[PDB]
DNA sequence: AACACTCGTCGCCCAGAGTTCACCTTGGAGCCAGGGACGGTTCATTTGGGGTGCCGGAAACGGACGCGTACAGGCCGTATAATGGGAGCTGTCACGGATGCA
């Protein structure tokens, strides 16, 4: 029941993430974003998918919020040499 | 084939099984009288405790905001000479009528 992808190890019940034994504390928004990324490993998720699921539907603001959060997650857990959370321009994001 | 003995069966006669019929007692079953203490109730405390609204403020956190970079798509130009397509395969018939020629 432990969510995994190679380096990243996310546990829902205890609510923190490991990088091969390296825990880091994340904000709730970014935590939901990372969780609902990891459960969709290798699959493209578009911006409406991201906003409707991680954020509530009634989010009436502009989209770059997810851009900033993906930047946060990249500088936090992608900070290893290899790049996992890749971006497909005009489509979305995939962790792979 | 001739001859002289011992055993059920019944009645009868006297004593009690045990049953009825029929006499005295005495532990009552309950009925009431009297006296707690008692547990249910109620009401005085009693301050031990729950409680809280707001903040100085410390720190996360959510996002705006400005400014860099990134391929995607578009425009543009290449100076020896290079000057009129391959290919299509066509076994129908009926037949009304226009139609280009009669």
């Amino acid at each position: 029941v432990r969510l995994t992808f190679a380096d990243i190890e996310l546990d829902e019940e205890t609510h923190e993430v490991w990088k091969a034994g390296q825990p880091v504390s994340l904000s709730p928004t970014e935590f939901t974003l990372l969780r609902y990324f990891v459960i969709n490993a290798g699959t493209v998720l578009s911006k409406p998918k991201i906003l409707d699921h991680v954020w509530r539907y009634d989010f009436g603001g502009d989209v770059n919020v997810v851009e900033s959060y993906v930047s946060y997650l990249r500088r936090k857990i992608d900070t290893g040499e290899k790049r996992l959370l890749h971006t497909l321009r005009g489509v979305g994001y995939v962790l792979r």
Side-chain angles (χ1 to χ4, degrees), chain A residues 1-29 31-88 90-96:
Chain A
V1 83
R2 207 138 192 244
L3 277 180
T4 313
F5 184 109
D7 44 21
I8 178 61
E9 177 115 358
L10 193 153
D11 158 3
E12 171 46 279
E13 85 154 13
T14 314
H15 198 333
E16 95 287 35
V17 304
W18 288 358
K19 324 322 161 303
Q22 176 57 274
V24 61
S25 280
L26 267 62
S27 298
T29 302
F31 179 76
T32 79
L33 199 139
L34 184 45
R35 174 291 181 201
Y36 143 86
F37 274 10
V38 167
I39 198 156
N40 303 357
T43 299
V44 177
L45 298 85
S46 77
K47 289 186 164 335
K49 325 262 190 254
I50 288 295
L51 271 292
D52 293 348
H53 265 236
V54 155
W55 289 265
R56 232 160 69 187
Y57 156 82
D58 37 355
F59 172 84
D62 166 343
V63 182
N64 314 67
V65 63
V66 58
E67 207 146 9
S68 85
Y69 284 100
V70 174
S71 166
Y72 282 16
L73 288 203
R74 231 90 77 79
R75 66 188 70 180
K76 176 91 51 173
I77 80 184
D78 179 307
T79 185
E81 311 185 306
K82 60 178 190 178
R83 184 141 21 219
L84 288 319
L85 195 37
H86 270 318
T87 307
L88 320 89
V91 195
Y93 309 84
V94 186
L95 167 147
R96 175 43 50 89

